[PDB]
Write a protein that holds these residues in place. Structure first.
Motif, PDB file in Angstrom:
ATOM      1  N   UNK A 208       0.827  -1.199   0.000  1.00 48.32           N
ATOM      2  CA  UNK A 208       0.000   0.000   0.000  1.00 48.32           C
ATOM      3  C   UNK A 208       0.866   1.256   0.000  1.00 48.32           C
ATOM      4  N   UNK A 209       2.041   1.161   0.615  1.00 50.70           N
ATOM      5  CA  UNK A 209       2.968   2.284   0.643  1.00 50.70           C
ATOM      6  C   UNK A 209       3.617   2.541  -0.708  1.00 50.70           C
ATOM      7  N   UNK A 210       3.596   1.557  -1.601  1.00 54.39           N
ATOM      8  CA  UNK A 210       4.326   1.576  -2.861  1.00 54.39           C
ATOM      9  C   UNK A 210       3.687   2.455  -3.927  1.00 54.39           C
ATOM     10  N   UNK A 211       2.434   2.876  -3.755  1.00 56.50           N
ATOM     11  CA  UNK A 211       1.826   3.807  -4.692  1.00 56.50           C
ATOM     12  C   UNK A 211       1.482   5.141  -4.054  1.00 56.50           C
ATOM     13  N   UNK A 212       1.708   5.294  -2.750  1.00 59.00           N
ATOM     14  CA  UNK A 212       1.758   6.632  -2.174  1.00 59.00           C
ATOM     15  C   UNK A 212       3.030   7.345  -2.599  1.00 59.00           C
ATOM     16  N   UNK A 213       4.115   6.589  -2.773  1.00 56.12           N
ATOM     17  CA  UNK A 213       5.427   7.199  -2.933  1.00 56.12           C
ATOM     18  C   UNK A 213       5.657   7.720  -4.343  1.00 56.12           C
ATOM     19  N   UNK A 214       5.222   6.984  -5.371  1.00 55.98           N
ATOM     20  CA  UNK A 214       5.650   7.287  -6.735  1.00 55.98           C
ATOM     21  C   UNK A 214       5.014   8.562  -7.267  1.00 55.98           C
ATOM     22  N   UNK A 215       3.841   8.930  -6.754  1.00 61.06           N
ATOM     23  CA  UNK A 215       3.298  10.245  -7.061  1.00 61.06           C
ATOM     24  C   UNK A 215       4.062  11.341  -6.338  1.00 61.06           C
ATOM     25  N   UNK A 216       4.585  11.045  -5.147  1.00 59.70           N
ATOM     26  CA  UNK A 216       5.402  12.016  -4.433  1.00 59.70           C
ATOM     27  C   UNK A 216       6.787  12.144  -5.043  1.00 59.70           C
ATOM     28  N   UNK A 217       7.307  11.074  -5.647  1.00 61.76           N
ATOM     29  CA  UNK A 217       8.571  11.179  -6.368  1.00 61.76           C
ATOM     30  C   UNK A 217       8.395  12.008  -7.633  1.00 61.76           C
ATOM     31  N   UNK A 218       7.271  11.831  -8.329  1.00 62.28           N
ATOM     32  CA  UNK A 218       7.022  12.591  -9.551  1.00 62.28           C
ATOM     33  C   UNK A 218       6.778  14.064  -9.252  1.00 62.28           C
ATOM     34  N   UNK A 219       6.043  14.354  -8.180  1.00 59.72           N
ATOM     35  CA  UNK A 219       5.737  15.739  -7.848  1.00 59.72           C
ATOM     36  C   UNK A 219       6.970  16.473  -7.348  1.00 59.72           C
ATOM     37  N   UNK A 220       7.829  15.779  -6.601  1.00 59.47           N
ATOM     38  CA  UNK A 220       9.069  16.388  -6.131  1.00 59.47           C
ATOM     39  C   UNK A 220      10.023  16.636  -7.287  1.00 59.47           C
ATOM     40  N   UNK A 221      10.100  15.691  -8.218  1.00 60.96           N
ATOM     41  CA  UNK A 221      10.980  15.832  -9.365  1.00 60.96           C
ATOM     42  C   UNK A 221      10.483  16.876 -10.351  1.00 60.96           C
ATOM     43  N   UNK A 222       9.175  17.119 -10.396  1.00 63.67           N
ATOM     44  CA  UNK A 222       8.647  18.233 -11.169  1.00 63.67           C
ATOM     45  C   UNK A 222       8.917  19.568 -10.499  1.00 63.67           C
ATOM     46  N   UNK A 223       9.085  19.577  -9.179  1.00 63.91           N
ATOM     47  CA  UNK A 223       9.412  20.809  -8.479  1.00 63.91           C
ATOM     48  C   UNK A 223      10.857  21.219  -8.713  1.00 63.91           C
ATOM     49  N   UNK A 224      11.741  20.249  -8.959  1.00 63.86           N
ATOM     50  CA  UNK A 224      13.137  20.561  -9.245  1.00 63.86           C
ATOM     51  C   UNK A 224      13.288  21.275 -10.576  1.00 63.86           C
ATOM     52  N   UNK A 225      12.633  20.765 -11.618  1.00 63.06           N
ATOM     53  CA  UNK A 225      12.798  21.327 -12.953  1.00 63.06           C
ATOM     54  C   UNK A 225      12.120  22.690 -13.068  1.00 63.06           C
ATOM     55  N   UNK A 226      11.004  22.888 -12.363  1.00 59.78           N
ATOM     56  CA  UNK A 226      10.341  24.186 -12.360  1.00 59.78           C
ATOM     57  C   UNK A 226      11.196  25.235 -11.671  1.00 59.78           C
ATOM     58  N   UNK A 227      11.943  24.829 -10.649  1.00 60.37           N
ATOM     59  CA  UNK A 227      12.859  25.738  -9.978  1.00 60.37           C
ATOM     60  C   UNK A 227      14.109  26.012 -10.802  1.00 60.37           C
ATOM     61  N   UNK A 228      14.556  25.040 -11.605  1.00 57.48           N
ATOM     62  CA  UNK A 228      15.674  25.278 -12.515  1.00 57.48           C
ATOM     63  C   UNK A 228      15.303  26.293 -13.582  1.00 57.48           C
ATOM     64  N   UNK A 229      14.043  26.277 -14.014  1.00 58.29           N
ATOM     65  CA  UNK A 229      13.574  27.249 -14.992  1.00 58.29           C
ATOM     66  C   UNK A 229      13.518  28.644 -14.393  1.00 58.29           C
ATOM     67  N   UNK A 230      13.153  28.736 -13.120  1.00 62.22           N
ATOM     68  CA  UNK A 230      12.969  30.016 -12.460  1.00 62.22           C
ATOM     69  C   UNK A 230      14.265  30.622 -11.947  1.00 62.22           C
ATOM     70  N   UNK A 231      15.366  29.864 -11.981  1.00 57.88           N
ATOM     71  CA  UNK A 231      16.651  30.223 -11.369  1.00 57.88           C
ATOM     72  C   UNK A 231      16.473  30.560  -9.892  1.00 57.88           C
ATOM     73  N   UNK A 232      15.747  29.689  -9.195  1.00 58.01           N
ATOM     74  CA  UNK A 232      15.381  29.883  -7.796  1.00 58.01           C
ATOM     75  C   UNK A 232      15.726  28.601  -7.059  1.00 58.01           C
TER      76      UNK A 232
END
Length: 64
Positions: free
Chosen positions: A1-25
């Motif tokens: 049950x823990x195995x599909x809570x995580x992968x959406x959190x990995x995707x959302x965190x990894x999308x936050x990295x690239x959005x911050x790279x675009x913003x230079x923030x």
């Protein structure tokens, strides 16, 4: 049950990295400078325990 809570959190965190790279923030600019101010604030406590070691606590309040 823990195995599909995580992968959406990995995707959302990894999308936050690239959005911050675009913003230079960068995410941890505060966490990088806080550790640069726990060092300057540790060379003041190193100095204050020198004056408090030579002169005690009764001298420390008597010179106010």
């Amino acid at each position: 049950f823990e195995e599909l809570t995580k992968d959406n959190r990995v995707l959302a965190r990894q999308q936050l990295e690239v959005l911050a790279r675009y913003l230079k923030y960068d995410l941890t600019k505060g966490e990088k400078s806080l550790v640069k101010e726990k060092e300057a604030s540790s060379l003041l406590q190193q100095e204050l325990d020198l004056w408090a070691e030579e002169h005690g606590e009764i001298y420390a309040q008597g010179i106010k």
